[PDB]
Amino acid sequence: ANPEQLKHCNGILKELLSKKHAAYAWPFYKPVDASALGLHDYHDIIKHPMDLSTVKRKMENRDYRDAQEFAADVRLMFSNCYKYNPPDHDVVAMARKLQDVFEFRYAKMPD
Ligand SMILES: [Cl-]
């Protein structure tokens, strides 16, 4: 069932990247460019950066062998946001909204 489940994961990924969610998904599209943002402590705090472009590359390259591996990366991305930013920052609100999209559809995985 890993291939079918991975198609569900790819569908989720496409949805997360889609225009429908862009108002809150956009901070997660590409790796955080810490230097560009003046976040000179980012890589001291976040040991394992993750973003949707990386998830997409990994999916396209058949790196993910199962849905759980995919989910762990998407959740890592959100965790990095929750770790680095104060909980009242807009980006955290954006993360929580995108994570809600993710978790509700991931829960519908065929099995
Ligand atoms: Cl997980």
Numbering used by the authors: 345 to 455
Sentences from the study reporting this entry:
The BET family proteins generally recognize acetylated histones H3 and H4 (and references therein); however, BRD2 preferentially recognize mono/di-acetylated histone tail of H4.
In both our apo- and the BD2-L10 complex crystal structures, the side chains of several residues are observed to display multiple conformations. Three of the conserved water molecules both in our apo-BD2 and in the BD2-L10 complex, are displaying alternate positions. The dynamic nature of these water molecules, as demonstrated by alternate positions, might have a possible role in facilitating the binding of Kac into the binding pocket. Alternate position of conserved active site water molecules along with this newly observed water molecule, demonstrate a flexible hydration shell in the binding pocket. Overall, these structural variations together demonstrate a dynamic nature of the binding site, necessary for the activity of the BD2.
